[PDB]
Amino acid sequence: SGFRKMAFPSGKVEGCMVQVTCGTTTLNGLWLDDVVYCPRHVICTSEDMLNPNYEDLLIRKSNHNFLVQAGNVQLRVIGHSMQNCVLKLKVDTANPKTPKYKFVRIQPGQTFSVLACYNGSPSGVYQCAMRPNFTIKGSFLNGACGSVGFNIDYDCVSFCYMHHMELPTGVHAGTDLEGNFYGPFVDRQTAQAAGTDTTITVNVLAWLYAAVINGDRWFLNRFTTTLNDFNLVAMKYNYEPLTQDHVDILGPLSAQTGIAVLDMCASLKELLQNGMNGRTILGSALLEDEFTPFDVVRQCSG
């Protein structure tokens, strides 16, 4: 027992991280088979980033203008392509450490592990949620661009995120591995609004189930509620509306705990209206929303 924010083991992704240099600019690429994927802003100077014409900038770049290093292994670039906001560099050598992998575009509220990298070298791993407003609350210093987010399923690495930018608010924005931004963000150093970031209600409920499984039961109250009554409270507190799809996803945890999802919603309601009165749940003094129902079952079934 116990409950921790837990990343996937990062080894399969560590083997894929390379350094991409184009003139002045160095960031991280992901080397799968004979293709290296990196942020297209690798072709920009600090100046270009104010208002880049990526098509025009890229036209002044040939294959030999892209230096790719996998540790000391220099890779040879034989082709380049812009796909949305990512560059695809065709290299002469298939990565021998290529894991079984897929590219997935994840839904807001889903979680994933980030391997934070600098100069093609891993520094650390943490768990992140795609916020409802399509930002992540990450940890990225200059040079982290090209660092990736992923899930693992037995042998298969599902890449879902590539880091591209920090908003002036200090939250993070990036793309899927087809180079399509999550959210309304662009790869340009302008002012960008994220919008209201709401709490992921189905995740808070999963984490309450986690807390019950671990003996933290103080917040369980005498009430129940309705989906409509609970959503009146969710809207007031900037929580995502709960749907019968969400209730269905919580079924296995309801079944394990013998606590009905609407009984748990009534507990959450009293928590939202009354606060925590200075107590804690699984060592937190606030309601945690970056664990999915899958995350809770993972860490409660191994």
Residues that bind a second copy (CB under 8 A): 1-12, 14-15, 115-116, 118, 122-126, 137-144, 166, 170-172, 214-215, 275-276, 278, 280, 283-286, 298-302
Q: Closest distance between a second copy and the C-beta of residue 27, in Å? A: 13
Tell me 199's DSSP state. Answer: B
Euclidean distance between CA atoms 261 and 273, whole angstroms: 18
Q: How far is the CB of 141 from a second copy (least distance, A)?
A: 5
CB of 288 to a second copy, least distance (A): 10
> Per DSSP, what are the bridge partners of residue 152?
157
Give the nearer residue to a second copy in terms of CB position, either 111 or 231. Answer: 111
Q: How far is the CB of 62 from a second copy (least distance, A)?
A: 31
Which SS3 state, helix, strand or coil, does residue 23 take? coil
SS3 of 260, please? coil
Residue 263: how many other CB atoms lie within 10 Å: 17
Closest approach of Cβ 178 to a second copy, in Å? 25
Q: Which of 170, 169, 175 is nearest to 147 (CA)?
A: 175
> Which residue lies nearer to a second copy by CB, 16 or 86?
16
Catalytic residues: 41, 145
Residue whose CB is less far from a second copy, 42 or 116? 116
Cα–Cα distance measured from residue 225 to residue 240, given in angstroms and rounded to the nearest whole number: 17
Query: With the CA atoms of 18, 22, 26 and 27 taken in that order, what torsion angle do they form, in degrees rounded to the nearest 10?
Result: -50
Q: How far apart are CA 180 and CA 187, in angstroms?
A: 11
Q: Alpha-carbon distance 52 to 66, whole Å?
A: 18
Residue placing its CB nearer to a second copy in the complex, 82 or 300 = 300
Per-residue b/e over 283-295, b at no fewer than 16 CB within 10 Å?
eeeebbbbbbbeb
Nearest to a second copy of 125, 233 (CB atom)? 125
